[PDB]
Write a protein that binds this ligand. Sequence first.
Ligand SMILES: Nc1nc2c(ncn2[C@@H]2O[C@H](COP(=O)(O)OP(=O)(O)OP(=O)(O)O)[C@@H](O)[C@H]2O)c(=O)[nH]1
Ligand SMILES: Nc1nc2c(ncn2[C@@H]2O[C@H](COP(=O)(O)OP(=O)(O)O)[C@@H](O)[C@H]2O)c(=O)[nH]1
Ligand SMILES: [Mg+2]
Lengths: 94, 49, 81, 427, 14, 426, 99, 80
Amino acid sequence: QEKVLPFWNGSEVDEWDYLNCFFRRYNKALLDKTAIDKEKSRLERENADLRSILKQYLDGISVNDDVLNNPVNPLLVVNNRLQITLTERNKARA
Amino acid sequence: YLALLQERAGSLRDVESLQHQNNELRALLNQYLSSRINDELQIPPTQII
Amino acid sequence: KPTIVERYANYGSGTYAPLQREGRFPESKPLGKEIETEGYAPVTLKGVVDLESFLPSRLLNQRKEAAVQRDLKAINDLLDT
Amino acid sequence: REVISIHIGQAGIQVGNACWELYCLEHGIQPDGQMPDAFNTFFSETGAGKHVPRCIFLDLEPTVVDEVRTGTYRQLFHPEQLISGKEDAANNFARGHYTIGKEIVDLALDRIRKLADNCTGLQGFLVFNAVGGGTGSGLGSLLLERLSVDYGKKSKLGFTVYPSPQVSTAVVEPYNSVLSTHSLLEHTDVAVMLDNEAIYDICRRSLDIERPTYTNLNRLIAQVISSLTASLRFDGALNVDITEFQTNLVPYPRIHFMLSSYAPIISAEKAYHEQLSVAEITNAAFEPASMMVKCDPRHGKYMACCLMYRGDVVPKDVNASVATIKTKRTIQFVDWCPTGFKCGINYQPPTVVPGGDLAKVQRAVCMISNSTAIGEIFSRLDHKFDLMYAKRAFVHWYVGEGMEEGEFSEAREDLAALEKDFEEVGA
Amino acid sequence: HEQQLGWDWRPPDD
Amino acid sequence: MREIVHIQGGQCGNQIGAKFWEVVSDEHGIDPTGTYHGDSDLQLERINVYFNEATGGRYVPRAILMDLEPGTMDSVRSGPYGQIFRPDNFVFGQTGAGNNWAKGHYTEGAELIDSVLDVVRKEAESCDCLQGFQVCHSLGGGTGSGMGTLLISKIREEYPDRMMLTFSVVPSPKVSDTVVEPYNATLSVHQLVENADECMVLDNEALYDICFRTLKLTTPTFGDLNHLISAVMSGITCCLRFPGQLNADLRKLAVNLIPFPRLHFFMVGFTPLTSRGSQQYRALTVPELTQQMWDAKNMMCAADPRHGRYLTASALFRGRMSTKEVDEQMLNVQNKNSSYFVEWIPNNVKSSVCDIPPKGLKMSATFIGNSTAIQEMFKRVSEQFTAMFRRKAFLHWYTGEGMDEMEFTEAESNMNDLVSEYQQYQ
Amino acid sequence: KKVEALGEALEMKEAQLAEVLTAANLDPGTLAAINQRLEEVLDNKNQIIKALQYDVAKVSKAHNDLIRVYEAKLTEFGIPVDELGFRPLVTNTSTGPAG
Amino acid sequence: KKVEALGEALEMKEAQLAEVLTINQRLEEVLDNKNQIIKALQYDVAKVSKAHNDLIRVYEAKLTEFGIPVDELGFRPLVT
Ligand SMILES: Nc1nc2c(ncn2[C@@H]2O[C@H](COP(=O)(O)OP(=O)(O)OP(=O)(O)O)[C@@H](O)[C@H]2O)c(=O)[nH]1
Ligand SMILES: Nc1nc2c(ncn2[C@@H]2O[C@H](COP(=O)(O)OP(=O)(O)O)[C@@H](O)[C@H]2O)c(=O)[nH]1
Ligand SMILES: [Mg+2]
């Protein structure tokens, strides 16, 4: 793209405005890199979310100390903690 | 500008690798979301989550 | 072996047509580490305003010193005299 | 290939008093100076089998210089290099740098220059001093500045003693060290760092002694100096010299303050039982308790480490040991350099001092490493200097002896800048 | 000039 | 007629060359005193390739030592066979290299390389019909790469019609000697890929793995490694000293190997390498010498050919053998391992046979491959370079001696495009 | 100010769309599907315009650069007659499409 | 970039207005304008490609007519 159009999509030249096309190319590179950064920034957070859901899923299958320690767990229920939590999640995700 | 280009190339490679890992993780998660133990329980982890 | 300026000035008017016999192919990546940034560019005004939001800081605008100060003070005093 | 040795103050010349005993024992020179190529770095030959050191011992108080003028080594030295002032600097930076410092530096420098002229090929200066007092700090700073102005390009190694974090003898040594860093950072080129309390604990742990005098410290530092300079004299598989040290251990111009360690620092009764092969002496040279400076490397990262193996060493077990060190987890190198080691081997086994504490060991290892684990030392010294500078305490002495305020202002800001530089090069 | 940013290039006289 | 001048740059190169000269003197049958005490005339028929008759049999080698310290020079004099070199060729400074590329290519180079060129030119004009140059050095130091590489460049500019063999001990990641090895390697390959004609690349990692597995040594000091590198450099060029059933000059090897003028890095091994114990049991005929030759664990390079493709191979056999047997060996190897080979080159293997085996052994062979998997070393060294060049670590010791960032970037880009050139064909 | 004018146009058009949809109150499904397939038609049109403009630029640059390289080779060989003139290209440099 | 994004947003919004009004004839005429732009542009591409081939032909003819070089030397030109 910029190998064949590095400039854009008649008197003498002053030193101040002397490099404007080069700055155009520089700005194009900056915009592309910022797009890269935004894309990455969303990818790592979605990856972290996937890791978290996977971990808590594996906990859901397994019989683990943290599974028991979490007071809201189907493995052992006291005073309807699980049911209250489920209805709260239902009303929050409704 | 050359330093910027090098940083852009590194970021692009990192993005590609991250997308690969995310796709693999999502495939593994979808594999877990269909299992015999996922249904044999009287309480499903899908509802638990 | 020419200089860089001679090499750039010779072929065409700032170009270079590499002969296939040398086997130096830097203009074509091995396609393994290929680069294509066209997809990342935003297509909607939502993406445009999001990129605008990103990175506003770049968007907007000793002992040696003491020794030099001592030397300049001495030479200034000498000039005064 | 030769190197000059200058010893300023009580601590420096006391360390040299054991260094030259060790050197004579190494090279076979009798105390009077006779032997009934390999010594050319440290001695110059003359007469009918006579050798004289390439050293100067200068100090203000003659009480200690008389000890070396009379104590069994009188015939060793040239009876002019033993400089003696008229009265002690009294722990006063201004008395050692401005009042009395301007009167003996001429006689010191006009002797250093002629020793350099006698020297065949100059390769480095090495300076012994402690920043815990005036006579060391101020005068060594002045003389180091003078040498940097005169020679400049030649390498300088300051084997400098800081005061311990809590085990402190002087009361004004925080002031003196803060005022001496202004030269110890900007004029010397490689700083090899010491600390009394670390050696105390090392000889309490390994050398199983509970009441160690200064003799033990001086001996086990002279051993480090000898292991440092062994590559210049003796033959080895991978000989490593002073310019190698400079180019490998100084990543940035203002980052040169390196730790030190020696192993096996072992007794004479554990030497037979406990085995001292390379694959374990290398590990024993990396524990935080074997660092000759009271610092904790686990609180930082290692920039670059350098290993010197004296004695029976084959260059493959060093590779295996370095691989084990890298694969270890309790330490973490700076992510800058994959190749973080500077190996070096020699052939002369460690040289025991008769009647000493160490033993006839077949091999030994000296490690010097540059790491970010010294910003803690700099910060603690800065804090304990600032607190005493708050109430304007002890400053009237320096004021009457020559300092006014700018010295303290610039020293304080310079130390702050150095600590920030270490912080920013850390991560 | 002609590659990077000239937009016009002019030789001197002699 | 044809002859080769030899240069030993730095400490590593000097010791490797000293062992090489001991090996050559043993093969040609001469004493450390310089006199000839061999047995046959086929060896003294062609000693003028490496030696000169001085006065009544005192043969003098055609090599020049080169370093910046006297300790290594004294060591090589004191060692055995060190009393044969011409004292007029012990050129060496005194200051010290400092393992610094700038200190070995811009200051001490500029202060001693006029003299080293003077002596090497004297030797190259004493010899009549030149054939090439031979240089031994390491790409991880200051005077190994600086001194030797500048000498390579100057000699290439002065005699640009002579085939050049530079033997380079590339740094290996596990055996990390110093801290600036990647910097020096980058700045050295930048000039080698541009001026020198072929480098045989070797590495201490494989030189130790060979000694631990094949030789089954217990404590291999540098003597054994230098012995192996010698035994390779001795058999690299034997068609000159001794007759052969199918001769092969150095230029013939170069033209058969190097397909394009920028793909001239050779990865080399030697056979047979039999342990002292299992040798008495081992069998030595051509269809196992070739098997060990193409054995991926015999290669003196930490780049397994199973990770890449072969552009060209060269097998130099020594001893009275069967040429048809050799040719069928190569053909069936290609057909067995067609995948590891490039499609558009029929018969990727060049085979040569010489009629005189080495001292003691009855058959021998040497392998020189141009595989495209050798890009691994350059990729790894470039990664180690860019790990430090982002933060300018250890860079002021070159900046103060007068090299900018422009040449560093040039050298790194050169490595990157070289890796690209290997990868594209594969 | 051009951006401001285009934003005003966007605002008025969006308000008009909102009022028109709230007036018509037609079923979502079919009308929405109408919307998406002509939106896809428009999107493909814009994409192919962009791609083919770039194709024109690329082929023109290759054309001009190859003309210059042939002229250079012929004038090096000494063939003095040059025939073809360069086309109005905007960007001149070394690149890929030459050999 | 904001200008071009706003322009395309304006076009698509006008398209939704036109389609939900059932104007549409104007939208389809604009689409026909875009199609004929496509046609003219690809016709220009065809012209330049054919002219590129024709100049390859004339240059090979010029070289062979003197024969001082052979038909081809060194590099090989790419064909669209
Ligand atoms: N290693 C070692 N350090 C010593 C010895 N003697 C004194 N020191 C150190 O020196 C510091 C005070 O001694 P110095 O300041 O050097 O005494 P000086 O050299 O005469 O200098 P002034 O005290 O200013 O006269 C103490 O904090 C100790 O740490 C010694 O024998 N060995
Ligand atoms: N094969 C072999 N390699 C060696 C020997 N001695 C040293 N080396 C290697 O050479 C490297 C030292 O580089 P050096 O020659 O000092 O760099 P220079 O000073 O610029 O020439 C080390 O990494 C060693 O692995 C030897 O006797 N044999
Ligand atoms: Mg005192």
